[PDB]
Amino acid sequence: EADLELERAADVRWEEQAEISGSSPILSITISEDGSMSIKNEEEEQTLGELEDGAYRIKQKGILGYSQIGAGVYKEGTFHTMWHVTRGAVLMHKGKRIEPSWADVKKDLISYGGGWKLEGEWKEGEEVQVLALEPGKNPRAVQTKPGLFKTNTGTIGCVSLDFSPGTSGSPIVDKKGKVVGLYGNGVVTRSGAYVSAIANTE
Ligand SMILES: [Cl-]
Numbered sequence: 001e002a003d004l005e006l007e008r009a010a011d012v013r014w015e016e017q018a019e020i021s022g023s024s025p026i027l028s029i030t031i032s033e034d035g036s037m038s039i040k041n042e043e044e045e046q047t048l049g050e051l052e053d054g055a056y057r058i059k060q061k062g063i064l065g066y067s068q069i070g071a072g073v074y075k076e077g078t079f080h081t082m083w084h085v086t087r088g089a090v091l092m093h094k095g096k097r098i099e100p101s102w103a104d105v106k107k108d109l110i111s112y113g114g115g116w117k118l119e120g121e122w123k124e125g126e127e128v129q130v131l132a133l134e135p136g137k138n139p140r141a142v143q144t145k146p147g148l149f150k151t152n153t154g155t156i157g158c159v160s161l162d163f164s165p166g167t168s169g170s171p172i173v174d175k176k177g178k179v180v181g182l183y184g185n186g187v188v189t190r191s192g193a194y195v196s197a198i199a200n201t202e
Helices: 015-020
Strands: 003-011 023-025 056-062 063-077 077-082 091-093 097-099 100-105 109-112 128-132 139-143 147-151 154-159 171-173 180-190 193-200
Touching: 003 063, 015 023, 015 139, 063 180, 077 180, 128 180, 147 193, 154 180
Parallel strands: 003 091
Antiparallel strands: 003 056, 023 139, 056 063, 063 077, 077 109, 091 097, 100 109, 128 139, 128 171, 147 154, 154 193, 171 180, 180 193
8 A cells, every 4th residue: 555645735724716616725935745836737646747835736646546535734844644545654755754743532533743833713703714735636726604603513613515535634724824723523513413623623
């Protein structure tokens, strides 16, 4: 079984176009390795192809090529993703090994390369953007207003499960550019609706 491989997709920022219209292409300043950057301007899931923050796709190669199994965010020397995406596996990026540094399986989080560094705090009422890296799609910022719900994990901010499951680990940002959490920790509300927690810790 092949190692999981990282692919830089986009900068981590708030996109003002998505604040205006609801969504936007992410308009990255640094080089991207995914296919949104190419002359085709289209991501190809099966192909693959640090001093700046970035959102990454997480891919694994099989006999038919790569599949994107998730996403994560590199920030201040640490790569952050969901526990269910990697399950503790080593990641590879351009020949570099990256082993896990910390996890909280209960919160569905794992960091690689140092401790957890996502500093954003969401509070009630506040709009955020999911910087969604869906399999097969170019990076997109999507404006949303999370809900505070009562869930099986407590009373938390949640977003609707409105993206591919292979978007899990994509960063969710506030207007300051801070990462309030990651997409894709599935929780169950009191009534029984499945939603994503904004996945972060305290
Ligand atoms: Cl942050």
